[PDB]
């Protein structure tokens, strides 16, 4: 129950690819109430990204099998029930992250960078809920994702330089929300193109600590652009 010890256990878990352990450690760190440092923020992000990503991946495989099984009642009933089991796991995970974001991380974010990071995370995890929502709940979840992104977007355009890795990543995921969730390729493309072009024009502003993430995100922006236009 010491902060630095739980963080070290978290990086041990990460090296062992035991991401449930790593996520449980940094939930414990977050629950101690203090604002997270950049390192702890990153370990909380990587942990839960891996925990939720396995379920997302499993969900897509089982969903596709249950789509292709339309004529065999007993097999479709089993694929459906398994997909819903994975779905419940995925929702509990997102709801876990989103609870930490509202109870601890967003209200404690002192500086714009922290605030934009946690609002990006809030949009990301509602987006994962949107990927699996249907009907009644889907409308409200999609809007929650959108409103989180938009606040992060506005704050980042006013306070962060265009090569800041968080601003770029926010643009990258927000564009994907417009493409895949809101079905608006126009806005997705323009929002990614703008972010790439304003970054490309100021590469003298890259620091050694952040140029690797910034240039990777830029490449991903352009790859999304190449995919969406063809």
């Amino acid at each position: 129950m010491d902060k630095n010890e739980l963080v070290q256990k978290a990086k041990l878990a990460e090296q062992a690819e035991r991401y449930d352990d790593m996520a449980a450690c940094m939930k414990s760190v977050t629950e101690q109430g203090a604002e997270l440092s950049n390192e702890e923020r990153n370990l909380l992000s990587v942990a839960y990204k891996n925990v939720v990503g396995a379920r997302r991946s499993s969900w897509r495989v089982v969903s596709s099998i249950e789509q292709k099984t339309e004529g065999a009642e007993k097999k479709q009933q089993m694929a459906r029930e398994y997909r819903e089991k994975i779905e419940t796991e995925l929702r509990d995970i997102c709801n876990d992250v989103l609870s930490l974001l509202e109870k601890f991380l967003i209200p404690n974010a002192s500086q714009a960078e922290s605030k934009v990071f946690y609002l990006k995370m809030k949009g990301d995890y509602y987006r994962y809920l949107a990927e699996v929502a249907a009907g009644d709940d889907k409308k409200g979840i999609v809007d929650q994702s959108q409103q989180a992104y938009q606040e992060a977007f506005e704050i980042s355009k006013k306070e962060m330089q265009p090569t800041h890795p968080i601003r770029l990543g926010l643009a990258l995921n927000f564009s994907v929300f417009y493409y895949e969730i809101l079905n608006s390729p126009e806005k997705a493309c323009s929002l990614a193109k703008t972010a790439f072009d304003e970054a490309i024009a100021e590469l003298d502003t890259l620091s050694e600590e952040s140029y690797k993430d910034s240039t990777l995100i830029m490449q991903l922006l352009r790859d999304n652009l190449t995919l969406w236009t063809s």
Partner: peptide, 10 residues
């Protein structure tokens, strides 16, 4: 093939 988000490696 799919949409790229960051962080990756899901």
């Amino acid at each position: 093939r799919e949409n790229n988000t960051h962080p990756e490696w899901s």
